[PDB]
Design a protein around this ligand. Structure first.
Ligand SMILES: [Mg+2]
Ligand SMILES: [Mg+2]
Ligand SMILES: [Mg+2]
Ligand SMILES: [Mg+2]
Ligand SMILES: [Mg+2]
Ligand SMILES: [Mg+2]
Ligand SMILES: [Mg+2]
Ligand SMILES: [Mg+2]
Ligand SMILES: [Mg+2]
Ligand SMILES: [Mg+2]
Ligand SMILES: [Mg+2]
Ligand SMILES: [Mg+2]
Ligand SMILES: [Mg+2]
Ligand SMILES: [Mg+2]
Ligand SMILES: [Mg+2]
Ligand SMILES: [Mg+2]
Ligand SMILES: [Mg+2]
Ligand SMILES: [Mg+2]
Ligand SMILES: [Mg+2]
Ligand SMILES: [Mg+2]
Ligand SMILES: [Mg+2]
Ligand SMILES: [Mg+2]
Ligand SMILES: [Mg+2]
Ligand SMILES: [Mg+2]
Ligand SMILES: [Mg+2]
Ligand SMILES: [Mg+2]
Ligand SMILES: [Mg+2]
Ligand SMILES: [Mg+2]
Ligand SMILES: [Mg+2]
Ligand SMILES: [Zn+2]
Lengths: 113, 53, 122, 206, 123
RNA sequence: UGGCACCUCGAUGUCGGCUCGUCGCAUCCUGGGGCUGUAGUCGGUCCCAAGGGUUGGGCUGUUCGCCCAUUAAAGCGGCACGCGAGCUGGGUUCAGAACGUCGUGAGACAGUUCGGUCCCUAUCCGUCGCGGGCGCAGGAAAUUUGAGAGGAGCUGUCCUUAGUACGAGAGGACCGGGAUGGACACACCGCUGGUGUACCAGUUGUUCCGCCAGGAGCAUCGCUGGGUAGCUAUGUGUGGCAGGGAUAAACGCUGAAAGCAUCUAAGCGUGAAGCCCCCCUCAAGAUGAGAUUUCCCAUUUCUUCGGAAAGUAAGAUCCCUGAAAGAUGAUCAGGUAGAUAGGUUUGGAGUGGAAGUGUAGCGAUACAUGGAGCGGACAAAUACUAAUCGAUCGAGGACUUAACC
């Protein structure tokens, strides 16, 4: 917490991000660099965690791809995310959802509000 | 772990140069006019800052 | 973070099915390898009838780890297991097809054949 | 060659034009004033003397406010000297702003490290432990003090003592952004010291 | 941070609850210097609950005050407890003062072990 | 490996490993050269050079050795075969037991095998940190010079020059430029993680708050899921960059002794990761006690003279509130000329939807009021509580000469 750092790192905050909680499915349109081309890759999964304050805030998205679980961590205010969607909202009782790492299908399902 | 030689009188007196204890920081009371410690309640007239406690 | 005596399963079509690490190439005192690093290793469990036999000393590359890599953009990737692909003297796989997701960092290490065969390059 | 004095405010991060993310250190460098100029004909060496923060007239003393009165300024809290500096500039009583630097400049950061108290050998000097099992009774001890022949132990035998609180220079640090209105300098990376510590920013010597 | 008083986290929790209740009941006690610099924070944070007057505030302060009788009145001789006095007697006194409901006065060393003793009083 | 028996039997602990190193050069790698039966890439041999570096495992108590896989390389030796008042105790060299062999026997081997008590509160020097005193011809507050000393010093791969030089081909450069790593070192906590016993939540048993509801004690913090400040690596930033002077081996110019020849006698030029500098840190007790800027001034009593004491000036301290500091001193932030600490009011990270009431359900329970309630150490305001009042220490500046006086 510091008032001077808050004012300096304010023009870089992203005003386009929506409101999401840990426990709901999101789709991330991330800009990906090839050898020479720029394309957008889609990452869809459930939000596992969300920590930080201000420009230093990050969040984590988990999906199971080809039978192997993958987790991807992003800064909230990065310009490398074209846009972010909230597909569905789930009911959870935790702020950190680490129990889904030791937990496979039909038992890792999240309810809906 | 055991003294090789006994300590002389001079060497035993030099070491005790710093084993003294300092003089108390006492002060004259404003009300009853006798000695007391600074920032402390006077033990005789039972007053601090000019008000009885 | 893979060092000597670390086991990691094989993720391609060759005969090997589990592998134990022998040495991490790159330097005299090097003691840790991560995504995109080549290691010397031995076969501890093989599927019957495969090309690669048990007890064989082979080289291999690391395609995914439980503690993944960080990109220059400030983002992170982690997987749920440590995986492995057996390679030849050059950077070509000894198998026919790859299983599971594969990190993007191999595209920066000139492992172009393994990238093409992967179902997903995350 | 330029130079200012500042206070370590904190650490944060910024996004560059490529989208890359870097860590930076915030330094506030207001109220810099030139106090004295030292020359060869009077001292034998050339330097410029700078004062960083003014303080209340109660905290100052009689000798101090007669020295800053030559430059027509309020008594200052931190005073340091800069060498290898062109004396043609730096008129007495002038204000030193953060605009002397610019984006992309390479600097050096001098400060006093954070304080660690009485510390042992494997934290202070990064030595190894002994076995924690197999019947051993040697865990966090210094080691052998030397051979038998000298009948003594040599100098520079590293042992426990007071660890921190010493001056450190970190070289070749980049400048990411300069904010003249807020008197703030953004330096990419780390600088020695705790919060509110004095930092001496000088151009790179190499 | 906060200071450990030569006792574990369970003894320390109990020590602060006995000393904070004694200052409410008696309003003037003898303790040591370090032991009084600590109950200076747990007592003023307790008057603030009494200045709210809520049921939520009363239930929160009831988890700290010990259950002991300050004195017995015949309203029908019914006892009066420390929680009642805190919310009905002590708290209304400081309805205008913002902070600093206590003061400390130094006395001198104690004969038995040389400990520095002080007065902490609730005004 | 031995010879002698000079110190030690009123006790000089004996192999291997661990922690910590330091020195020699008869150089393992890197640096510079001469010769080659040196085409190129590789090599052999010798000369200069000790600046840095010199791996992880299998078997064995093992040093040694062989093997597996790497590396630029996996050097040889000294220091009581360095190091047990620093560690271990696998081997050796105590009492038990068994095998083979020897002995009539009790027993033995310098054969094997299983098990087998490693004591000590540091006096002096020595080493690593931290204070007090006096000194530095007046008393003070800051900023500094650097005599001297310590640290650092390592190196791989890829691209280009160039498929050029070389070579019949196969193969394949020197010199130069750029990028990026291994090991190591310093600093820091914004990021990824760890911890986080006065933060938040779920839950079992039993006792208590008279009962329900709501809570408290004990059970490893009772257990479980998270986590603030601080401290941290495996995390992040940076470093060994580019150079100068004199040289070693070596290669040369001019040049006689000795009409030629000759790198030598006189005189000149190149020439190493090495020396002295450049880079980082300490440093005027450097008794050789240095320098600059600023502040206070020339009091009063006594002495026979050297001189003394007693109020002070500038300044500092005793005492008190503390942390960015700390074993204690010390350092630093402050003492009403006040935001130093606590409290209070707004926030923040963190946790996750409080109590009360109401609705739905037979009930466990769910929903609403409501991102609610709580919230150590984090931020800003506020003088409300405590830094009250006081006391102590601390100058008046010797003599000679020299430019002006
Ligand atoms: Mg959050
Ligand atoms: Mg132990
Ligand atoms: Mg307990
Ligand atoms: Mg001999
Ligand atoms: Mg004889
Ligand atoms: Mg004897
Ligand atoms: Mg002996
Ligand atoms: Mg003896
Ligand atoms: Mg022996
Ligand atoms: Mg030699
Ligand atoms: Mg050669
Ligand atoms: Mg030995
Ligand atoms: Mg010894
Ligand atoms: Mg026997
Ligand atoms: Mg017989
Ligand atoms: Mg055994
Ligand atoms: Mg001892
Ligand atoms: Mg961190
Ligand atoms: Mg109940
Ligand atoms: Mg309980
Ligand atoms: Mg009980
Ligand atoms: Mg816990
Ligand atoms: Mg926990
Ligand atoms: Mg160099
Ligand atoms: Mg030269
Ligand atoms: Mg001086
Ligand atoms: Mg603070
Ligand atoms: Mg002070
Ligand atoms: Mg305050
Ligand atoms: Zn009195």
């Amino acid at each position: 917490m510091n008032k001077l750092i808050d004012e300096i790192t304010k023009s870089q905050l992203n005003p386009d991000v929506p409101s999401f909680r840990p426990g709901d499915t999101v789709r991330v349109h991330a800009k990906v660099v090839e050898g020479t081309r720029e394309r957008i890759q889609l990452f869809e999964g459930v939000v596992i965690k969300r920590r930080g304050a201000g420009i230093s805030e990050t969040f984590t998205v988990r999906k199971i791809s080809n039978g192997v679980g993958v987790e991807r961590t992003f800064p909230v205010h990065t310009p490398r995310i074209a846009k972010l969607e909230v597909i569905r909202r789930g009911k959870v009782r935790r702020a950190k959802l680490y129990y889904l790492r030791n937990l496979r299908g039909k038992a890792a399902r999240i309810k809906e509000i | 772990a055991v003294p090789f030689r006994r300590t002389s009188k001079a060497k035993k007196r030099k070491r005790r140069t710093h084993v003294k204890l300092q003089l108390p920081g006492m002060n004259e009371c404003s009300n009853c006019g006798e000695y007391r410690l600074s920032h402390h309640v006077c033990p005789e007239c039972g007053q601090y800052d000019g008000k009885d406690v | 973070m893979i060092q000597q005596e670390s086991r990691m399963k094989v993720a391609d079509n060759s005969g090997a099915r589990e592998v134990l690490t022998i040495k991490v190439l790159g330097g005299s005192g090097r003691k840790t390898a991560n995504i995109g690093d080549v290691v010397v290793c031995t076969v501890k469990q093989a599927t019957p009838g495969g090309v690669v036999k048990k007890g064989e000393v082979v080289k291999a590359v690391i395609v995914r780890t439980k503690s993944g890599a960080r990109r220059q953009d400030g983002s992170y990737i982690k997987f749920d297991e440590n995986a492995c692909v057996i390679i030849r003297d050059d950077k070509s796989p000894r198998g026919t097809r790859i299983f599971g997701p594969v990190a993007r960092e191999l595209r920066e290490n000139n492992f172009m054949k393994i990238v093409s065969l992967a179902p997903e390059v995350l | 060659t330029k130079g200012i004095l500042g206070r370590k405010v904190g650490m944060t991060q910024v996004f560059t034009e490529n989208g890359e993310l870097i860590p930076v250190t915030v330094i506030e460098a207001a109220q810099n004033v030139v106090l004295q100029k030292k020359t060869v004909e009077t001292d034998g060496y050339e330097a410029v003397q700078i004062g960083f923060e003014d303080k209340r007239a109660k905290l100052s003393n009689k000798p101090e406010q007669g020295h800053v009165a030559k430059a027509d300024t309020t008594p200052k809290r931190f005073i340091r000297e800069f060498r290898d500096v062109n004396l043609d500039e730096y008129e007495i009583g002038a204000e030193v702003k953060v605009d002397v630097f610019a984006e992309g400049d390479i600097i050096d950061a001098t400060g006093v490290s954070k304080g660690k108290g009485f510390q042992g050998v494997i934290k202070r000097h990064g030595q190894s432990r002994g076995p924690m099992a197999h019947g051993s009774r040697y865990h966090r001890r210094p080691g052998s003090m030397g051979p038998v022949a000298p009948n003594r132990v040599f100098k520079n035998k590293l042992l426990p003592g007071r660890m921190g609180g010493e001056q450190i220079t970190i070289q070749n640090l980049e400048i990411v952004k300069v904010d003249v209105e807020k008197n703030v300098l953004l330096v990419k990376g780390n600088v020695p010291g705790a919060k509110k510590a004095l930092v001496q920013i000088k151009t790179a010597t190499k | 941070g906060y200071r450990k008083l030569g006792r574990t986290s369970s003894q320390r929790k109990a020590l602060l609850r006995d000393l904070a209740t004694d200052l409410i009941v008696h309003e003037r006690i003898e303790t040591t210097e370090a032991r009084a610099k600590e109950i200076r924070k747990v007592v003023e944070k307790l008057i603030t609950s009494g200045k709210k007057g809520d049921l939520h505030a009363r239930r929160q302060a009831a988890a700290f005050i010990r259950h002991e009788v300050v004195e017995v009145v015949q309203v029908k001789n019914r006892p009066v407890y420390a929680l009642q006095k805190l919310f009905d007697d002590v708290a209304p006194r400081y309805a205008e003062r913002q902070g600093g409901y206590t003061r400390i006065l130094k006395k001198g060393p104690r004969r038995g072990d040389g400990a520095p003793m002080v007065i902490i009083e609730l005004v």
